[PDB]
C-alpha cells in the first residue's frame, strides 16, 4: 500500500517533478526506498537504456509506478512469512535477514552479465530480474523496509555493501556477493574482515546508513551512461539536483563518496550560487576525518583526480601522497584488488604521463614547474613510502619488478639538484615509515639514479644475474 | 560497464 499522500505528485512530467517527490519523501518519517528506486529506475530506463520516442522526459504515471510497486511488495510479502521470525524488542533476527537475502537472490535470472550498467534499481529487479552486486544489498534493505523492519540498514565500504541490524543496530550480515570468483559469505558477519585489517571492511570505519543515507546511495547509483561516448544530460541534471537536495538536508554529512561525486558533477556543469568543486572535495576529506577516523582512500583519490585533470601537478602529487598515507595502515588482503588496481594505475600510468608532460613544458621554459619543486619530489617519495608500508605485514605482497621501472623513470624526472634539497630525517623534510624507502634514501640524490640498486631495494629480489 | 556507486574515476 502506497499511501494517499505519496501519490499526489504523479504524474511526474519532469526532472523537477522527480526532485519534488524526493523532497516530499525525505520530509516523511521514513522515505519510501521502494517507491524512490522504482521511480529512478523507470526514469533511467527511458533516458539511458531506451530513448526511442523520447521528446522531453519519460512521464511516470501513477498507474505504472503503482503496478511496479505492487509487484515488489507482493513478491516479498508472499515469500517472507514474518510469523516464522518473531521480533524480540523491535529488532530483526539474523535468520530473518538471511531469508530476505535468499528471496532476492533466488529471484534473479539464472545467467546474466553482472557487470552491466543500469541493473542497480528495483526497476531492473522487477522488469529484468537482474541486479548488480550492491543492488542486491539495496534491494534487501528495501524489502526489509516494506516488511516493517526499521532496524535493517545498508552498510557501505568503499567497494562493498552489506546490512546492519539487530539490538542497537550492532549486528552485521553479508547479503550479496563481492567481486568475481570469491566464495559467498551471505549470512555471516563482517568481523573476520574487520579483524584482518583489509581495505574492503575499512578496519570497521564503514558507513552505517540511516534511511536518508540509503536515499543518497540510490542517487549515487544513478548511471547516466547511454554508451561509452555519451551520457544523458537529463540524468546528470537529476543526479546533481538530488545530491544538492540531500546536501541541504544534511544527509551527505557522513557520506564522503557522495560529496566527491557531487564535486565532480559541479566541475562538469557548475550550479550558480553553490560551493566550488574544491570546497566539496575538501568537505569529503573532512567527513572522512570526522566520522571515519581518516581511514578512507577515495576522498583523496577524488581530490587528486581533480588536480590531475586540471594539471595542478603539485596538488595532485600531494593528494596521492595523502592517499598512500591512509593505505599504509592497512593489510593488503585477498578481496582488496580494486584498490591495488587504483594505486597501480596512479604509480605506473597516471604519474608517468603527468611528469612526461611536465618535462616537455619545462623544456619549453615553464616557471614554477613541479619538476623543480622539491616538495613535489617529497610528495612522490611519500606516495611510494605509503605503498611500501601498506605491504609490511600484509598476507600478499604489493610491489614487484613491474613497478620498479616506473619508479626509476619518475625519480629521474627530477634533476639531482632538486632531489638533493629534500632532507630525509629519521625517527623540505620528509620522514619515511617503510623499511623499503629508508634503505633507498642514499640512492635518492645521485645525479644519475642507480636503476639496478633501486630495483633491488624496491622488490624481494636480492641477487643479480649469474652470467 | 559497472562501477561501485560513487567510486571516483572511470
User: Has residue A412 been placed in a domain?
Assistant: no
Crossing angle, helix A337-345 and helix A313-327, to 10 degrees? Answer: 150
CA distance A351 to A369: 15
* Closest-CA distance of chain B to residue A116, Å: 5
CA distance A391 to A340: 11
Phi-psi map region of A181: left, alpha, beta (phi>0 left; psi -120 to 50 alpha): left
User: Which residue in A214, A209, A217 sits closest to A169, CA to CA?
Assistant: A209
Inter-chain CB proximity B2 and A114 less than 8 Å: yes
CA distance A124 to A117: 10
Q: Residue A423's beta-bridge partner residues?
A: A429
Cα A166 to Cα A77, A97, A104, A144: the distances in Å are 20, 10, 20, 12
CA distance A198 to A175: 19
* Count of CA atoms in the C-beta half-sphere (13 A) of A458: 24
User: Has residue A355 been placed in a domain?
Assistant: no
CB A124 within 8 A of CB A61: no
- Who among A117, A134, A160 is closest to B1 (CB)? A117
Residues 6+ apart with CB under 8 A from A432: A381, A385, A424, A438, A441
Q: Residue A429's beta-bridge partner residues?
A: A423
* Closest-CA distance of chain B to residue A88, Å: 34
* Closest-CA distance of chain B to residue A201, Å: 15
User: Has residue A425 been placed in a domain?
Assistant: no
Q: Determine the 3-state secondary structure of B3 from DSSP.
A: coil
CA distance A59 to A11: 7
Residue A8 phi/psi, 5-degree rounding, is -70, -20
CA distance A209 to A137: 12
Number of residues written out for chain B: 10
CA distance A311 to A366: 13
CA distance A175 to A161: 8
Inter-chain CB proximity A264 and B9 less than 8 Å: no
CB A164 within 8 A of CB A155: yes
* Closest-CA distance of chain B to residue A187, Å: 21
CA distance A70 to A64: 10
Crossing angle, helix A15-26 and helix A233-249, to 10 degrees? Answer: 20
Three cell numbers, residue A280: 566539496
User: Has residue A102 been placed in a domain?
Assistant: yes
Inter-chain CB proximity A305 and B8 less than 8 Å: yes
Q: How far apart are the first and last CA of chain B?
A: 10
Q: Residue A156's beta-bridge partner residues?
A: A161, A207
Q: How many domains is chain A partitioned into structurally?
A: 1
Inter-chain CB proximity B2 and A116 less than 8 Å: yes
Q: How far apart are the first and last CA of chain A?
A: 79
Chain B hits for A133, CB-CB cut-off 8 Å, are 2, 4
Phi-psi map region of A429: left, alpha, beta (phi>0 left; psi -120 to 50 alpha): beta
C-alpha torsion A441→A445→A447→A451, nearest 10: 20
Three cell numbers, residue A76: 516479498
Residue with cell 585477498: A334
User: Has residue A101 been placed in a domain?
Assistant: yes
Minimal Cα distance from A262: which residue of B? B6
Inter-chain CB proximity A159 and B1 less than 8 Å: no
CA distance A385 to A382: 5
Chain B hits for A260, CB-CB cut-off 8 Å, are 6, 8
Q: Residue A165's beta-bridge partner residues?
A: A171
Q: In terms of residue numbers, what domain contains A15?
A: 4-226
List residues in chain B touching A: CB distance below 8 A: 1-2, 4-9
CA distance A381 to A373: 13
CA distance A251 to A216: 7
User: Which residue in A134, A147, A112 sits closest to A34, CA to CA?
Assistant: A147
Q: Determine the 3-state secondary structure of B6 from DSSP.
A: coil
Size of interface A-B (CB pairs under 8 A): 41
Q: Residue A162's beta-bridge partner residues?
A: A155
- Pairs from A107-111 (Cβ < 8 Å, separation ≥ 24): A107/A75, A108/A136
User: Which residue in A163, A212, A220, A210 sits closest to A190, CA to CA?
Assistant: A163
Phi-psi map region of A117: left, alpha, beta (phi>0 left; psi -120 to 50 alpha): beta
Residue A2 phi/psi, 5-degree rounding, is -60, 140
C-alpha torsion A274→A277→A282→A286, nearest 10: 50
User: Has residue A432 been placed in a domain?
Assistant: no
- Map chain A to HEC letters: CCCHHHHCCCCECCHHHHHHHHHHHHCCCCCCHHHHHHHHHHHHHHHHHCCCCCCCCCCECHHHHHHHHHHHHHHHHHHCCHHHCCCHHHCCCHHHHHHHHHHHHHHCCCCCCCCCCCCCCHHHHHHHCCCCHHHHHHHHHHHHHHCCCCCCEEEECCCCEEEEECHHHCEEECCCCCCCCCCCCCCCCCHHHHHCCCCCCHHHCCEECCHHHHHHHHHHCCCCECCCCCECHHHHHHHHHHHHHHHHHCCCCCCHHHHHHHHHHHHHCCCCCCCCHHHHHHHHHHHHHHHCCCCCCHHHHHHHHHHHHCCCHHHHHHHHHHHHHHHCCCCCCCCCHHHHHHHHHHHHHHHHHHHHHHHHHHHCCCCCCHHHCHHHHHHHHHHHHHHHHHHCCCCCCCCCHHHHHHHHHHHHCCCHHHHCCCEECCCCEECCCCHHHHHHHHHHHCCCCCHHHHHHHHCCCCCCCCC
What is the biggest distance separating any 2 CA atoms in chain A, rounded to whole angstroms?
84
- Who among A119, A260, A342 is closest to B6 (CB)? A260
User: Has residue A254 been placed in a domain?
Assistant: no
* Closest-CA distance of chain A to residue B10, Å: 10
* Count of CA atoms in the C-beta half-sphere (13 A) of A386: 24
Minimal Cα distance from A157: which residue of B? B4
List residues in chain A touching B: CB distance below 8 A: 114-117, 119-120, 132-134, 158-160, 217, 220-221, 257-258, 260-261, 264, 298, 301-302, 305, 338, 342
Give this entry's resolution in angstroms: 1.6
Burial class (CB in 10 A: 0-12, 13-18, 19+), A238: buried
User: Has residue A341 been placed in a domain?
Assistant: no
* Count of CA atoms in the C-beta half-sphere (13 A) of A282: 6
Amino acid at each position: 500500500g502506497l499511501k494517499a499522500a505519496q501519490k499526489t505528485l504523479f504524474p511526474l512530467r519532469s526532472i523537477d517533478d522527480v526532485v519534488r517527490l524526493f523532497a516530499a519523501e525525505l520530509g516523511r518519517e521514513e522515505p519510501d526506498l521502494v517507491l524512490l528506486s522504482l521511480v529512478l529506475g523507470f526514469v533511467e530506463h527511458f533516458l539511458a537504456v531506451n530513448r526511442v520516442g523520447l521528446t522531453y522526459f519519460p512521464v511516470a504515471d501513477l498507474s505504472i509506478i503503482a503496478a511496479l510497486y505492487a509487484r515488489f511488495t507482493a513478491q516479498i510479502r508472499g515469500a517472507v512469512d514474518l510469523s516464522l521470525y518473531p521480533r524480540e524488542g523491535g529488532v530483526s533476527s539474523r535468520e530473518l535477514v538471511k531469508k530476505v537475502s535468499d528471496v532476492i537472490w533466488n529471484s534473479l535470472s539464472r545467467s546474466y552479465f553482472k557487470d552491466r550498467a543500469h541493473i542497480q534499481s528495483l526497476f531492473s529487479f522487477i522488469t529484468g530480474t537482474k541486479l548488480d552486486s550492491s543492488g542486491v544489498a539495496f534491494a534487501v534493505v528495501g524489502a526489509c523496509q516494506a516488511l516493517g523492519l526499521r532496524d535493517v540498514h545498508l552498510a557501505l565500504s568503499e567497494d562493498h555493501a552489506w546490512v546492519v541490524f539487530g539490538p542497537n543496530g550492532e549486528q552485521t550480515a553479508e547479503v550479496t556477493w563481492h567481486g568475481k570468483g570469491n566464495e559467498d559469505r551471505r549470512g555471516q558477519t563482517v568481523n573476520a574482515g574487520v579483524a584482518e585489517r583489509s581495505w574492503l571492511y575499512l578496519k570497521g570505519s564503514y558507513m552505517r546508513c540511516d534511511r536518508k543515507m540509503e536515499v543518497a546511495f540510490m542517487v549515487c547509483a544513478i548511471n547516466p551512461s547511454i554508451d561509452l561516448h555519451t551520457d544523458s544530460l537529463e540524468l546528470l541534471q537529476l543526479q546533481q539536483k538530488l545530491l544538492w537536495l540531500l546536501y541541504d538536508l544534511g544527509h551527505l554529512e557522513r557520506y564522503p563518496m557522495a560529496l566527491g561525486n557531487l564535486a565532480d558533477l559541479e566541475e562538469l556543469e557548475p550550479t550558480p550560487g553553490r560551493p566550488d568543486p574544491l570546497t566539496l572535495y575538501h568537505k569529503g576529506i573532512a567527513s572522512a576525518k570526522t566520522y571515519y577516523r581518516d581511514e578512507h582512500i577515495y576522498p583523496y583519490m577524488y581530490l587528486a583526480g581533480y588536480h590531475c585533470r586540471n594539471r595542478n601537478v603539485r596538488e595532485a602529487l600531494q593528494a596521492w601522497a595523502d592517499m598512500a598515507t591512509v593505505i599504509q595502515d592497512y593489510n593488503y588482503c585477498r578481496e582488496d584488488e580494486e584498490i591495488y588496481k587504483e594505486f597501480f594505475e596512479v604509480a605506473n600510468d597516471v604519474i608517468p604521463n603527468l611528469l612526461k608532460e611536465a618535462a616537455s613544458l619545462l623544456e619549453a621554459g615553464s616557471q614554477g614547474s613541479a619538476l623543480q619543486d622539491p616538495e613535489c619530489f617529497a610528495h612522490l617519495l611519500r606516495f611510494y613510502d605509503g605503498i611500501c608500508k601498506w605491504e609490511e605485514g600484509s598476507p600478499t605482497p604489493v610491489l614487484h619488478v613491474g613497478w620498479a621501472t616506473f619508479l626509476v623513470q619518475s625519480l629521474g624526472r627530477f634533476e639531482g639538484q632538486v632531489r638533493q634539497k629534500v632532507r630525509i630525517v629519521s625517527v623540505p623534510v620528509l620522514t619515511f615509515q617503510s623499511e623499503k624507502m629508508k634503505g633507498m634514501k642514499e640512492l635518492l640524490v645521485a645525479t644519475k639514479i642507480n636503476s639496478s640498486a633501486i630495483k633491488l631495494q624496491l622488490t624481494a629480489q636480492s641477487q643479480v644475474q649469474m652470467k | 560497464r559497472w562501477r561501485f556507486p560513487a567510486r571516483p574515476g572511470t
